Design an enzyme around this catalytic site. Structure first.
Site, PDB file in Angstrom:
ATOM      1  N   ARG A  29       0.871  -1.155   0.000  1.00 23.02           N
ATOM      2  CA  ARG A  29       0.000   0.000   0.000  1.00 23.02           C
ATOM      3  C   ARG A  29       0.902   1.197   0.000  1.00 23.02           C
ATOM      4  O   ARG A  29       1.807   1.315   0.839  1.00 23.02           O
ATOM      5  CB  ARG A  29      -0.903  -0.075   1.276  1.00 23.02           C
ATOM      6  CG  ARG A  29      -1.752   1.153   1.523  1.00 23.02           C
ATOM      7  CD  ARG A  29      -2.771   1.409   0.401  1.00 23.02           C
ATOM      8  NE  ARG A  29      -3.819   2.336   0.784  1.00 23.02           N
ATOM      9  CZ  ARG A  29      -3.686   3.657   0.701  1.00 23.02           C
ATOM     10  NH1 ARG A  29      -2.548   4.220   0.291  1.00 23.02           N
ATOM     11  NH2 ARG A  29      -4.713   4.451   1.027  1.00 23.02           N
ATOM     12  N   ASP A  34      -4.002   8.564  -1.053  1.00 25.80           N
ATOM     13  CA  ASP A  34      -5.210   7.817  -1.187  1.00 25.80           C
ATOM     14  C   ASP A  34      -5.743   8.015  -2.622  1.00 25.80           C
ATOM     15  O   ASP A  34      -6.034   9.138  -3.024  1.00 25.80           O
ATOM     16  CB  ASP A  34      -6.234   8.285  -0.157  1.00 25.80           C
ATOM     17  CG  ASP A  34      -7.483   7.388  -0.115  1.00 25.80           C
ATOM     18  OD1 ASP A  34      -7.337   6.150  -0.260  1.00 25.80           O
ATOM     19  OD2 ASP A  34      -8.575   7.914   0.138  1.00 25.80           O
ATOM     20  N   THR A  35      -5.804   6.939  -3.385  1.00 22.94           N
ATOM     21  CA  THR A  35      -6.448   6.979  -4.700  1.00 22.94           C
ATOM     22  C   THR A  35      -7.901   6.620  -4.499  1.00 22.94           C
ATOM     23  O   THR A  35      -8.274   5.903  -3.612  1.00 22.94           O
ATOM     24  CB  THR A  35      -5.779   5.986  -5.715  1.00 22.94           C
ATOM     25  OG1 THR A  35      -5.622   4.722  -5.113  1.00 22.94           O
ATOM     26  CG2 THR A  35      -4.379   6.531  -6.133  1.00 22.94           C
ATOM     27  N   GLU A  37     -11.238   4.385  -5.150  1.00 22.69           N
ATOM     28  CA  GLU A  37     -11.404   2.957  -5.447  1.00 22.69           C
ATOM     29  C   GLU A  37     -11.777   2.832  -6.928  1.00 22.69           C
ATOM     30  O   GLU A  37     -12.279   3.811  -7.544  1.00 22.69           O
ATOM     31  CB  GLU A  37     -12.505   2.328  -4.558  1.00 22.69           C
ATOM     32  CG  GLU A  37     -12.227   2.475  -3.023  1.00 22.69           C
ATOM     33  CD  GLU A  37     -10.971   1.743  -2.500  1.00 22.69           C
ATOM     34  OE1 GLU A  37     -10.769   0.623  -2.978  1.00 22.69           O
ATOM     35  OE2 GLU A  37     -10.189   2.262  -1.571  1.00 22.69           O
TER      36      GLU A  37
HETATM   37  C1  LIG Z   1      -1.908   4.170   3.903  1.00 25.39           C
HETATM   38  C2  LIG Z   1      -2.170   3.520   5.223  1.00 25.39           C
HETATM   39  C3  LIG Z   1      -3.372   2.863   5.448  1.00 25.39           C
HETATM   40  N1  LIG Z   1      -3.610   2.269   6.647  1.00 25.39           N
HETATM   41  C4  LIG Z   1      -4.948   1.680   6.968  1.00 25.39           C
HETATM   42  C5  LIG Z   1      -5.877   2.813   7.456  1.00 25.39           C
HETATM   43  C6  LIG Z   1      -7.219   2.465   6.862  1.00 25.39           C
HETATM   44  O1  LIG Z   1      -7.917   1.574   7.787  1.00 25.39           O
HETATM   45  P1  LIG Z   1      -9.475   1.152   7.524  1.00 25.39           P
HETATM   46  O2  LIG Z   1      -9.456  -0.016   6.523  1.00 25.39           O
HETATM   47  O3  LIG Z   1      -9.882   0.668   8.876  1.00 25.39           O
HETATM   48  O4  LIG Z   1     -10.178   2.357   6.985  1.00 25.39           O
HETATM   49  C7  LIG Z   1      -6.870   1.648   5.603  1.00 25.39           C
HETATM   50  C8  LIG Z   1      -6.994   2.550   4.361  1.00 25.39           C
HETATM   51  O5  LIG Z   1      -6.475   1.809   3.240  1.00 25.39           O
HETATM   52  P2  LIG Z   1      -7.244   1.831   1.822  1.00 25.39           P
HETATM   53  O6  LIG Z   1      -7.273   3.252   1.367  1.00 25.39           O
HETATM   54  O7  LIG Z   1      -6.352   0.940   0.980  1.00 25.39           O
HETATM   55  O8  LIG Z   1      -8.631   1.310   2.079  1.00 25.39           O
HETATM   56  O9  LIG Z   1      -5.510   1.259   5.762  1.00 25.39           O
HETATM   57  C9  LIG Z   1      -2.658   2.253   7.641  1.00 25.39           C
HETATM   58  O10 LIG Z   1      -2.937   1.716   8.756  1.00 25.39           O
HETATM   59  N2  LIG Z   1      -1.465   2.840   7.468  1.00 25.39           N
HETATM   60  C10 LIG Z   1      -1.206   3.524   6.300  1.00 25.39           C
HETATM   61  O11 LIG Z   1      -0.101   4.090   6.210  1.00 25.39           O
HETATM   62 CA   LIG Z   2      -7.737   3.864  -1.689  1.00 28.16          CA
END
Ligand SMILES: Cc1cn([C@H]2C[C@H](OP(=O)(O)O)[C@@H](COP(=O)(O)O)O2)c(=O)[nH]c1=O
Ligand SMILES: [Ca+2]
Length: 129
Positions: A29, A34-35, A37
């Site tokens: 990731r 944030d892109t 979906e």
């Molecule tokens: C980018 C990033 C996301 N995340 C977690 C937070 C968000 O939790 P939740 O799933 O509970 O919302 C999720 C967002 O990722 P996505 O944008 O891929 O969904 O990933 C981290 O914990 N650390 C990070 O650095």
């Molecule tokens: Ca995303």
């Protein structure tokens, strides 16, 4: 921070993909972005942008920050480089991602990315149109 080698296994979407890192498959990731979906506006365009940038690269590298290297879902958290160009920055500069998820201690490139976002917003690109 330092860059380490990886190879592409499969594109996934604008801010995730599957890489081989230290010889093991991992979903990564992208830090600090944030892109949308795939089902959202600009989601297909973010996916296509990251897919092309990573698949066309001769060399992929991952750069972990100072903090957490994997998230609660087991995804690696990194800055990804394609032939030396940071994917995270390039998405933000094109208005295909927002700066987001800036957690203290994994935020080394925050200001570099906010400068790209200001430029994308000035240009009214994509998400900022
Ligand atoms: C980018 C990033 C996301 N995340 C977690 C937070 C968000 O939790 P939740 O799933 O509970 O919302 C999720 C967002 O990722 P996505 O944008 O891929 O969904 O990933 C981290 O914990 N650390 C990070 O650095
Ligand atoms: Ca995303």
């Amino acid at each position: 921070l330092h860059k380490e080698p990886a190879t592409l296994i499969k594109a996934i979407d604008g801010d995730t993909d599957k890489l081989m890192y230290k010889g093991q498959p991992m979903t990564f990731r992208l830090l600090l972005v944030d892109t949308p979906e795939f089902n959202e506006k600009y989601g297909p365009e973010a996916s296509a942008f990251t897919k092309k940038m990573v698949e066309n690269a001769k060399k992929i590298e991952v750069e972990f920050d100072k903090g957490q290297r994997t998230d609660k879902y087991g995804r690696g958290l990194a800055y990804i480089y394609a032939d030396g160009k940071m994917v995270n920055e390039a998405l933000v500069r094109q208005g295909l991602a927002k700066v987001a998820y800036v957690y203290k201690g994994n935020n080394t490139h925050e200001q570099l990315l906010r400068k790209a976002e200001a430029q994308a917003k000035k240009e009214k690109l994509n998400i900022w149109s």
